[PDB]
Structures are given as C-alpha cells and as structure tokens.
Amino acid sequence: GVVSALSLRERIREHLS
Amino acid sequence: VFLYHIPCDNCGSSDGNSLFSDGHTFCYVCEKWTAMTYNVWNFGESNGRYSALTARGISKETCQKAGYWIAKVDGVMYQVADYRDQNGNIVSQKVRDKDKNFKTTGSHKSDALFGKHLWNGGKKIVVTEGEIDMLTVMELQDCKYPVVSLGHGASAAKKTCAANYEYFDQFEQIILMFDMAAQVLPAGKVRVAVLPCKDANECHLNGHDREIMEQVWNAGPWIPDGVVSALSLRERIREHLSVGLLFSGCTGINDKTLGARGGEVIMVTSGSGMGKSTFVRQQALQWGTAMGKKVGLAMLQESVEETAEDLIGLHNRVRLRQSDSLKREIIENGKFDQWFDELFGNDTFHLYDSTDRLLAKLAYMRSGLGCDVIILDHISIVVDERKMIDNLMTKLKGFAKSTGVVLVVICHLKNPDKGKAHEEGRPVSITDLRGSGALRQLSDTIIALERNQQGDMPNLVLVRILKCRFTGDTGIAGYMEYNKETGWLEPSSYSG
Amino acid sequence: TYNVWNFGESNGRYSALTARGISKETCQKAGYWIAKVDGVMYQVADYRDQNGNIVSQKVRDKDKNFKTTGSHKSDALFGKHLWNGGKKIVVTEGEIDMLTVMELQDCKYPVVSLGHGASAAKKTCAANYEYFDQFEQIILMFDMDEAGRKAVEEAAQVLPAGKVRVAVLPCKDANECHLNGHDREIMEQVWNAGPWIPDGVVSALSLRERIREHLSSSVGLLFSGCTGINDKTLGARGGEVIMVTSGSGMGKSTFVRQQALQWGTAMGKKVGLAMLQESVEETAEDLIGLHNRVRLRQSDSLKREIIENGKFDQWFDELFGNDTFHLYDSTDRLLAKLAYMRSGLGCDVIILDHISIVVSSDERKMIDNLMTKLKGFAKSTGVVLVVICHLKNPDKGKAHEEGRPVSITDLRGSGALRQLSDTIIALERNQQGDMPNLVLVRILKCRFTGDTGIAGYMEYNKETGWLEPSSYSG
Amino acid sequence: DGVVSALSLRERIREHLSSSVGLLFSGCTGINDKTLGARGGEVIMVTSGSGMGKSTFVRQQALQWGTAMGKKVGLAMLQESVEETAEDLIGLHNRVRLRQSDSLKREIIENGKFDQWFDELFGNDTFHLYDSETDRLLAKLAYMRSGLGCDVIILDHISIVVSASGESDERKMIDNLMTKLKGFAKSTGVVLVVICHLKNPDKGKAHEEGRPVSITDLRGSGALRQLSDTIIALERNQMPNLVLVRILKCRFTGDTGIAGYMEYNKETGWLEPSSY
RNA sequence: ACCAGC
Numbered sequence A: 001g002v003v004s005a006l007s008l009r010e011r012i013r014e015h016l017s
Numbered sequence B: 001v002f003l004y005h006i007p008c009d010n011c012g013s014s015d016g017n018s019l020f021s022d023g024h025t026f027c028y029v030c031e032k033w034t035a036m037t038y039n040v041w042n043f044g045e046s047n048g049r050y051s052a053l054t055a056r057g058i059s060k061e062t063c064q065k066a067g068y069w070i071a072k073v074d075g076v077m078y079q080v081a082d083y084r085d086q087n088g089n090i091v092s093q094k095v096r097d098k099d100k101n102f103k104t105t106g107s108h109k110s111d112a113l114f115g116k117h118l119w120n121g122g123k124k125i126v127v128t129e130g131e132i133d134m135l136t137v138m139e140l141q142d143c144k145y146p147v148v149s150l151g152h153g154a155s156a157a158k159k160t161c162a163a164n165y166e167y168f169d170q171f172e173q174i175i176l177m178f179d180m181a182a183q184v185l186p187a188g189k190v191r192v193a194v195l196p197c198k199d200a201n202e203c204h205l206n207g208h209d210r211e212i213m214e215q216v217w218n219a220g221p222w223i224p225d226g227v228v229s230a231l232s233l234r235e236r237i238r239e240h241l242s243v244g245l246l247f248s249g250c251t252g253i254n255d256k257t258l259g260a261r262g263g264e265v266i267m268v269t270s271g272s273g274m275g276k277s278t279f280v281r282q283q284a285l286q287w288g289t290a291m292g293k294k295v296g297l298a299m300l301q302e303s304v305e306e307t308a309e310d311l312i313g314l315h316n317r318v319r320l321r322q323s324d325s326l327k328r329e330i331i332e333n334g335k336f337d338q339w340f341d342e343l344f345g346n347d348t349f350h351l352y353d354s355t356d357r358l359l360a361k362l363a364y365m366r367s368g369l370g371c372d373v374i375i376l377d378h379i380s381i382v383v384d385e386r387k388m389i390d391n392l393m394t395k396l397k398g399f400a401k402s403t404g405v406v407l408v409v410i411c412h413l414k415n416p417d418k419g420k421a422h423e424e425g426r427p428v429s430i431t432d433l434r435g436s437g438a439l440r441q442l443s444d445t446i447i448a449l450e451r452n453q454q455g456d457m458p459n460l461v462l463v464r465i466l467k468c469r470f471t472g473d474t475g476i477a478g479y480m481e482y483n484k485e486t487g488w489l490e491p492s493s494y495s496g
Numbered sequence C: 001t002y003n004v005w006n007f008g009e010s011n012g013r014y015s016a017l018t019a020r021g022i023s024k025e026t027c028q029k030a031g032y033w034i035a036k037v038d039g040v041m042y043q044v045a046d047y048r049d050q051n052g053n054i055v056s057q058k059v060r061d062k063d064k065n066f067k068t069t070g071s072h073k074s075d076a077l078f079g080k081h082l083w084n085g086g087k088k089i090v091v092t093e094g095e096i097d098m099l100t101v102m103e104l105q106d107c108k109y110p111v112v113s114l115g116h117g118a119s120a121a122k123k124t125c126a127a128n129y130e131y132f133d134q135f136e137q138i139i140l141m142f143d144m145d146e147a148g149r150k151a152v153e154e155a156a157q158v159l160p161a162g163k164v165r166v167a168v169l170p171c172k173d174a175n176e177c178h179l180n181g182h183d184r185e186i187m188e189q190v191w192n193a194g195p196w197i198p199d200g201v202v203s204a205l206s207l208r209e210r211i212r213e214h215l216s217s218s219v220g221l222l223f224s225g226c227t228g229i230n231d232k233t234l235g236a237r238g239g240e241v242i243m244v245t246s247g248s249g250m251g252k253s254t255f256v257r258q259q260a261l262q263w264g265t266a267m268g269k270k271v272g273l274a275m276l277q278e279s280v281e282e283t284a285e286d287l288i289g290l291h292n293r294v295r296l297r298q299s300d301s302l303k304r305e306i307i308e309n310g311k312f313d314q315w316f317d318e319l320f321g322n323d324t325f326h327l328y329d330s331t332d333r334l335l336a337k338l339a340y341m342r343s344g345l346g347c348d349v350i351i352l353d354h355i356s357i358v359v360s361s362d363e364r365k366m367i368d369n370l371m372t373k374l375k376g377f378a379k380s381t382g383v384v385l386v387v388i389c390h391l392k393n394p395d396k397g398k399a400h401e402e403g404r405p406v407s408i409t410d411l412r413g414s415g416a417l418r419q420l421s422d423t424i425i426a427l428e429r430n431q432q433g434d435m436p437n438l439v440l441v442r443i444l445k446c447r448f449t450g451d452t453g454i455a456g457y458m459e460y461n462k463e464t465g466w467l468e469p470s471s472y473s474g
Numbered sequence D: 001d002g003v004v005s006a007l008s009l010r011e012r013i014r015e016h017l018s019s020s021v022g023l024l025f026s027g028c029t030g031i032n033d034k035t036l037g038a039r040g041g042e043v044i045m046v047t048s049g050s051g052m053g054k055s056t057f058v059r060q061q062a063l064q065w066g067t068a069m070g071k072k073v074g075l076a077m078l079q080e081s082v083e084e085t086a087e088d089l090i091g092l093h094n095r096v097r098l099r100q101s102d103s104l105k106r107e108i109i110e111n112g113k114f115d116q117w118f119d120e121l122f123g124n125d126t127f128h129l130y131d132s133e134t135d136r137l138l139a140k141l142a143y144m145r146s147g148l149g150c151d152v153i154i155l156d157h158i159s160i161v162v163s164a165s166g167e168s169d170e171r172k173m174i175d176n177l178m179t180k181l182k183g184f185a186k187s188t189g190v191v192l193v194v195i196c197h198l199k200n201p202d203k204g205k206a207h208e209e210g211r212p213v214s215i216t217d218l219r220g221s222g223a224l225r226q227l228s229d230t231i232i233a234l235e236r237n238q239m240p241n242l243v244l245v246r247i248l249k250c251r252f253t254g255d256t257g258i259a260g261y262m263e264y265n266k267e268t269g270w271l272e273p274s275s276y
Numbered sequence E: 001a002c003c004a005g006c
C-alpha cells in the first residue's frame, strides 16, 4: 500500500492528461 | 556391581571372566557377555538400525542409550526419537526427515521430556531446547551425567516445565541452555549460562566445545527481567553521547527549541484552513532534499499525485495548481522530467496512499525503508471519541520510543464560544486541543500558527511555541511573511 | 470405571500394613482391602452409605495413581457408616490417619475420614452440614503443611461454631508420629487441643510487644529544595503513597528527579525508578548532568568536550560507585517486577511515572483495581511509593498552565485516586506571566499532619537546573 | 411455617420492650437530639470527602463507647494495619499526639510509662481488632458476634471490599453485600457502623471546600441509602477546623438537617463542641 | 587383557 515517489514518472502527466 | 572373578569358558582363562550381582558375566579376554496416526511404530518392522550420525558427529552408543534410531521404511530415511515414562515403556515417538515432516505418533503428552527414564538421583541437570545439542552434551560427557531436553521446544516452556515440578525438585541445581525464560522452577536454584555461538552444536563443529564445558560447571545466576543496575551503564551512555534538526523557514525557532531529537513528538496546529499543510510541506521539502535525511509523508488530505505536484511546483518557486497554461507549457517542451530527476534522484521522499493497519505500515516504513522523519496529517478520519484518540496517541508514543524517529503530527482546534474567533487573530491557549486532553500530555513540542486573513496583513503569520520539554522557552517566536506568487513564506522582521 | 469390584472376583484378602504400622484387625474392621488383578496388587478402599450400602470404590496402584469406579458422590465419607452418634469426633485428612487413630484408641472414639482431601474439602463439608448437627465436639486433624493449614482454615467456615477444635502435630500427620513413637503426645492433642482462634482476629493484649516494636522503629525522609514542605509533612515513612501533580509540562519529572538525586547521593537510600516517559539513557544523562550542576543534553559542545579529556569516568565513578540506583526498562507483570525490585534487591524508595499509559474497556474499574493493588503492595511492606499523575480539562475559566490555582478534584480518570493517596502535592507556575521560574507548592491532602494549602516558594534556575528555596512573598 | 398470628404474640411483645435502647453519641448534643443514640440492629453510615476526618470521629466514638460503657467492640480497620490503629487510641486517651511526635516515643520507652498506658485502657477485653475477598469477612464478623460476643461492629473503608474483587458488574455485588449485611444485622441484632465515601460533583465547589452534600452523592450504587437507617455527613472547609454534622436520613426519628458544630484540637485530638 | 600404586 506504500508507494515511493520514484514510481511517479508516468503518473503525474497521466493525471494532467 | 562387580563382585569377583570366575574362570572363563570361551577364552579358557583363569581370572578373565567377572561375575556381577545382576547375574551376568563378562570376560575381558574373549569379550563375551552373558545373562493422526495414533500408532507406535515397531522397531523391527520398520527396519530399525542404530546408525551413527556422520554429518554432525554422534557415536553409536549414545544413540543406543538414548533411543534415537533410523528407519528405512518406504525407501526413505526417518530419524525416530522415543519418549518414555518412569516405568520404562515407550510412550510416544517423533519422526524427523530432510523436509522436517513433524509426524508425532502415539500419545504425546504435554509434559513429555527426553532422557528421564534413567535418571532420578543426582546434583546437576542440563536442560536444552532441541535433541542434537542434548546428544552433543552426552557425547562430551560420555553419557554419564543427568541431561534432559524439552519435548515441545522453547515456545511452550510455560506448559511442559510447569507440569513437571517434583521431578526437577529432586535435584540441587538446574542449569538452562535455551537461547544463546521459565520462572515456574523454585528460586535460588536455577542457573543460566551463555555460549559464544548459536548453540552447543556450533561449538562442537567449530572447536569451541571447551566453552560448552566451562559454562556447564561454572554457570551464571538467574537475573530475571530487565531490572538493570547502575553498573551496566558504562558503554551505553558513552554510545548515546555520540543532534537537533534545524527548523528551516525561521531562525527564531531554533534559538529556543534546539531542534528535534530521536523519539521526538512535534504537534502542528492552527485554525480552520490557516495553512498547516503548506508549512509542514515546506519543512518536509527543506528537510528531505537539502539535509540527506529520508522522510516519510502520510498526507491524508490530498492524493499522492497532488502532493507530488505541490512539491514539484514549490521547489521550482512557481504556483502549479493555479494556472492551466503553466501546466500545459511545461509538458510541451520537455522540462517536466528535468524537475523530476534532480529532485527524485536521491529518493529521500516516500509518500503514502490511503486503524491498526496504519501502525504496521509505519513500522514497515521505519524499519524496512530506513527513514528518520515521519509526518502524519488529518487525524480526524482516524478518530466514543476519547478512548480511541488516547489509545492512538499511546501507540504512537510507544512507536516513537526506543526507535530514533521524529514524529510530526498535524491536528486541529475546537470551536470557541465567546469573544473573537481564531480567524480574526485570537491568541490560542494550550487547552484548545480538541478530541481529548492527553494530546498535550504526550507531545513534546507544540507549534501553533496565528494569522488574520481579514485584518491589515492577510499574509503575516505568527509562530507560538506552547510546550517545550527540552529548554522551557514558550511564547512568540517571530513573524513570517507569506508569498502569494511563489508559495515560499519568508522570515520577516515585523515588530509589534 | 467399570463396576464396584467384589473381593471374590478380584481375589480380596485382608492383611496388615508393615511399612505404615497397621495390623490386619483395623483393615478388617474398616474395609480397606487388596485386589489381585492384572498381576499387580492393587490397594482399594470401600465407601458405604448411612444404611451400609456399598456405593463407591477408591482404587490406588503401586505407583501412586488414582482410579475412581464411577460416580463419586459429594457426601462420601470414609468411616461414616460405622458410627451414628457420639460426643467427640476426629476428622482426618487422609485415609491412613483414620486407621492410625483406630489403632491407637482400640475402636472407641467415632473417627471418620474425608472423601475429597484438601482440594475440595469445603464442598464436602458444606454438603455434610446435617450430619454434624448430631455431635457435640469436632476435632479437626489435618496435615502440617501449607495446604493443610489452608484446608483447616477455609473448611472450618461451613461448620457449626463452638464445636470445632484444632490439634497440632510435630510430624507431617499422625502416622509418622506413630512410626517415630510419639504415641503419648498425640493423645494429649486428642484430649486437649486448641480452639478456633487463629482465623485472623487478634486479642487486645497480645499486641503489647509488637506495638513496642513499631514504637522502636519509621523515620521520614527529608525533602530538599524547600524547608516549608517538611514543616507540614514530616518526611515520608513506610507504607506512604505520595501523589504528585501539576499541569502539562510544569516540572513534575524535574522535581521528582531532583528529589531522587538528593535522596540518593546524600542519604545512601536504594532508589528504584520506573520512568516510562523516556528511556534509560536520557534519564541517566540527566542525572549525570544534574549532579555536576550543568545541563548535559542541552549542550552538544560540552558533550563533545567531556568525552575527549576523559573526565566522564570521573563523573561516572562518583555517582555509580556504590550502585545505589536501579533503573527500569520499558500490566500485571509490572507489579511482579516491582516486587522483585523491593524484595530481591532491597530498595527503600520506589518511584513511578505517568500512570495514564498503564491504565491505557472501562478505565474507572481498571484504575481502581490498579490503585487497590498498589495500596496492597505498599501495605505490609514499608516502602515509600511516589506516583506522578496529570490533570483534566476545566470547563470554564483560564487554563491550568497559566497560573490558575488547582483544586483537589481536578485529578483525571476517576475519584478513587485521592481516596487512597496519602499526601497529594500540586505544583503551580505561570509560563506566560511575569516570572516563569517561580513555583508554588500546594498540599491538597495530608492524612498524617493535616496541614493543607500553600507550603512555600522556590525559584527555578535555567542554567544549572537546580531550583533553590526563594524568599518571595505573595 | 412462618404464618405467625398476631394473637399468640402477647408475651413476645411484652418481653421485647423489656430489654434495647441506649448507647448515646458524643461530641454534640443535636446528634443525641435527632438520633437518640445507636441501637441494636441499625445501620449507621458516616460520610465525608477525602481526608476530612471521617476516621478520627469514628475512633473517638469507639473510645467513648469502649471506655464509658465497657461494651465489647469489634473493629475492622482496612485503612491501616493493627500496629497503628491501636497506637493512636493511647495518644487519644492521654490527650497527646503519640504518632505525630518522635520525641515522646523514646521518652515513653525509657520511662516505662507505655506499660502503664497500655494497662490503664486495655485491662478489659472490650477491643477486638482485625487485619487484612468478601465471603470470609462476614464469617469473621459472625465469629465476633457469636464467639467473641461483640456489641458494636465497625467496618472501616468499604471502598476496598467491593473493588478488590474481580467482578463484571460491581453494583449487583454491592447490592448482594448490602442485603446480606442487613440480614446479618437483623438476625444478630448488633450495632453496626459502616464507613463509605462520596463521588465527584459535576460542577461547583469541592467537598473539601465547603460544598453542601446531597443524598445522591454516594459513590457506587443507590442501595446505600435505601438499606440503611442513619446517615451522618461531616463537612468543613480548608476557619480550617469548623466542622458541622448533617443528619441526612433518620428512620427512627424525623428531625434531619444541621445538627451542630464541632472544633478540632491540634494538641489533644478530641472533637470539642462548638458554639458558633 | 590393560592401567596405577607399593
């Protein structure tokens, strides 16, 4: 359930899309 | 017992054969001796052989005198051990193989031991937790001294050792070799010795078996629990002497707080929406990537991506969530990953995605990932509303104790009744913490934020220290000015 | 298990007892016989009803094991069928004792035996209350063990009063005194025994020496920092629970630690701490820094300095040379650890801290049971017990930390804390007022002297940590 | 059966009023005017706050009942041990502070006057003490009534005989203990004094500050005022020595309310009658 | 049969 900040490379731009 | 000598018949000697009181004779020359499953396995049916163990080292006579025999049934190899009674009959068996298939056949009692069917009188006794170490002590002592072993392990010592009391009462001194704690035995009698290896088998296989036998005859006292005398604090204090983390954003805080320590509870409060998340986010961003410490956040208000966008827009001194064209421009030119890599190359930040399930995740974050500062936000969803919050604060104080972690907790305030509200600039008191009255009893540092959004300066804030155990300096720390264009609030020099 | 074993089908035979000293006549009269089944000779006892109907067997083997033949009744007494009246009975614990008394009296006095032993004697004596009404004197004859004293104490409660008399024996019970030749000393215990006195009540004249012993004992430990406190407290004696309270972070632990240091380095008293707020190393460094009149943890440069020049051992040996201090490492197990700290180590002062985690269902019954257990532990021990507690939230008015005078009914959690604590001391200071280093001591409750109110004033030092007796006038 | 007709009862009613009445109190006159002394088979319940002197008054009444009348008195002090509750009565007889003076202890050891102080009061067998479950205590009291032959039974500090046992619901245990003690006092016909405590008020002042007590301020249950005969409350303020007595319930008489005023002595320990 | 003696 704990996700580190390194794996948010293709998630922030997916949220902004 | 020996009586006298008779002339032998096999060797034909005169004084070679010896007669005993038991009726048997023995010659020293010719070497001739005269005279679940619920099924106990027969010895001759399952091909019982007294083979000596080779890979660890146990003689054949010890396996004969102990009853630890190898079965060759069904083409595989089993090591059956036998548990007996005081009468001299087989009570139960234990089957062990390479996969450790624990197939305990027969009536396995709750007070089953090993090696008690031969020994009733004596002075010393050695109790072990396994069977290989017990046979190893029998190898070192040539199978002549009283040594027993538990038949259920060191996990259920409160049942096996408690049921057998009069058997251990017959001796003078009881020596334990469990782990390198059962108080049901009488006091002033039980000794516990310490070996420099894992068990006796490692000292046997690594030449330290002398350190077995030096600890048997010279074992140490009981020493029940963690009652620590003052003599045993020579090196722990010297290790503890060989640190306050600096509060970024204002220099007036560190002049009277001297930072935070290992096992330090910091509480952050203000009015309804006065910017607790922004201030704690600024402290997290200035502590994570600028000091080399690993920080674990647990922001429960927003999601993971939204606080990631906050952090990215904060560090680049812009306002990301306040313009759509600014979000659109940074992705069309490839500068988005440049903000990503220079901030997340060190991986000091760890976010949390969303009540006892939280404490295991905090333990997995602290022990596993190895962080130093853990931040919790929005306590209202987690928390009758008096017993739960007190139990939660007690569990977090116990988690922060003896770990070395800085625990930051964001809380709220209650609604006032008379006078002016908190949004107009009311000086907050210490007893305004809602939910309970124990939140100011376990917290070690309490910081309150005060600002007036409808007054003269809607971007001037005040920091108020309410509780400090380290120094004892509480009150107004200073003033800071908030930026409506970059988000970074700066230390000001406003005077009253 | 199966049925009542007949002597014909089990080869019954009445013989004597050489190893215990009983002839065959007594076992012939009673009915304790020997069966030859399955090779091993089994001993077996017979039970009868009031009329004489055989109802139960007790089968015992060669290796001290028990075997019941079926439903063992609660009114089963060994020897009840033979006697139906009399003025003086003797109740024995086991079964060989009754045969021994029959041997030494030539079958004259009505002597019976129990059917349960010392484990369930109260039930079988409550279920046999109607049988003991037709008698005139009852002589209890039990073992000279702790279980025997427990049986003769608790089983003599459901018996009629004025007819119960207890005899004593120098052996375990009467049979070894029969074997050791003490046949004359047991008959005087049958004829003239001691009545049902030692239940727990005492006489008004038997205390005359012991009140003298307490008169020759019980000196109060003088407090430090203020001489106005000792003028209305007169120290702390054995069995004294002292409660300390103030607001949140007002100086409870600092004052208690200073009191502990002044009792340690100046009186030689063995002090046991149970500090649960912080661990062992922090309070150890606080004691070391406070003895040297500095603030040890509040100076990183001083901690770096004193470890280089080697003067840390000069401060360690002067404190922990005699090992007068004994610390604790962090619910019912705490009582056992404090019992081992008192009895096994030999301390005189026991200090706890922050009782709210210890009481962390309904908290009121838990804190009442906890205070009852600590009061019972302080009773009959002779130890000073210092307990630190906190306060609750006031409804209206100002806060407790802002210099508000605190009342005795502000102790949180329950009202049972002030009902058992002897001396309650509250601390008052105002951190937001004029002087945040001037404190006030308030005696809220005092069972011994009875003088309550403001004791004195002390001034706190921000540099050395030693608060001093001031001379302020309110 | 228990169907006793009223006609065959003339001799029992004639002998019932022949035996009793008496055992006057001490300290105040209004207590004797409103309660008319303590009688056999009654339940006297003395209430106060915390450390308000609820034990000193009962020990002073016990001294006046054991000295001036010679009645056999059985005490059950669970607040302190028997080494102290028999010590303070000597100082109360000799008008000094025996426990509160280290200098007088060595003086009565050396001069041997402690032997004379023990002989001048304990020459008779009128004091039966006890030191420390709930089932064996009533057996001790039955032994004191039947075997020892006591007249006044004092049960101090009831709050540790209903809380020291492991029970799910305490109130039914309090009810059972209260009705069994009432049945014991009815069957034996003995003077019985039982000391309890009060609870926390919801607002206002404290009971140690001059709060007027209510009858619903009893802590633990509501059977303490429904199965008792006389309820006596003590109140003072901390004039730190002006204590007043309130009769909250009297089943025999009807006059309740304020009985009077007493003053505490700091040199002798007696409770002198005040004037106000 | 072996080991030790004194």
Ligand SMILES: Cc1cn([C@H]2C[C@H](O)[C@@H](COP(=O)(O)OP(=O)(O)OP(=O)(O)O)O2)c(=O)[nH]c1=O
Residues within 6 Å of the ligand: B441, B468, B469, B470, B471, B472, B473, C246, C247, C248, C249, C250, C251, C252, C253, C254, C255, C277, C429, C436, C437, C438, C439, C460
């Ligand atoms: C009495 C006093 C203490 N102090 C400082 C020194 C103390 O170490 C610090 C408070 O630490 P503590 O003494 O530990 O406070 P506490 O025991 O009353 O309560 P808690 O631990 O639960 O918070 O306050 C002052 O600055 N001025 C003062 O006058």
Ligand SMILES: Cc1cn([C@H]2C[C@H](O)[C@@H](COP(=O)(O)OP(=O)(O)OP(=O)(O)O)O2)c(=O)[nH]c1=O
Residues within 6 Å of the ligand: C419, C420, C446, C447, C448, C449, C450, C451, D048, D049, D050, D051, D052, D053, D054, D055, D056, D057, D079, D236, D240, D241, D242, D243, D264
């Ligand atoms: C009544 C009274 C007592 N005192 C003193 C005498 C004693 O030292 C102390 C109270 O005496 P105690 O009778 O021992 O107090 P208590 O019985 O009410 O306490 P608890 O409920 O916990 O058992 O206060 C006064 O100073 N002035 C007074 O008016």
Ligand SMILES: [Mg+2]
Residues within 6 Å of the ligand: C252, C253, C254, C277
């Ligand atoms: Mg503290």
Ligand SMILES: [Mg+2]
Residues within 6 Å of the ligand: D054, D055, D056, D079
């Ligand atoms: Mg009292």
Ligand SMILES: [Zn+2]
Residues within 6 Å of the ligand: B008, B009, B010, B011, B012, B013, B016, B017, B027, B028, B029, B030, B031, B032
């Ligand atoms: Zn031969």
